[PDB]
Design a binder for these strands. Structure first.
Length: 43
DNA sequence: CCCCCTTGAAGACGTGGTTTACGACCCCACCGCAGTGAGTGG
């Protein structure tokens, strides 16, 4: 946007839909299951 | 125009006697934001 966008950028406001990132190198895999949880077990 | 009086009184400063007056005390049968907290359910 404009001024609100700059204000958001300088205040380090987290977006409502953060993108998942690779915390560490390794082969990804799917693990257990829950009501709304999809595991990301990584070797 | 220096000097000591006179001589009559005008005011000058208390002053606490005399006398008000103040102050107080007594009775009255929007805006989005983020941190907090329970509050679960598990």
């Amino acid at each position: 946007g404009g001024l609100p966008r700059v204000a958001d950028l300088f205040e380090a406001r987290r977006p409502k839909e953060p993108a998942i990132l690779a915390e560490i190198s390794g082969i990804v895999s799917f693990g257990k299951e829950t009501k709304g949880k999809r595991r990301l077990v990584i070797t």
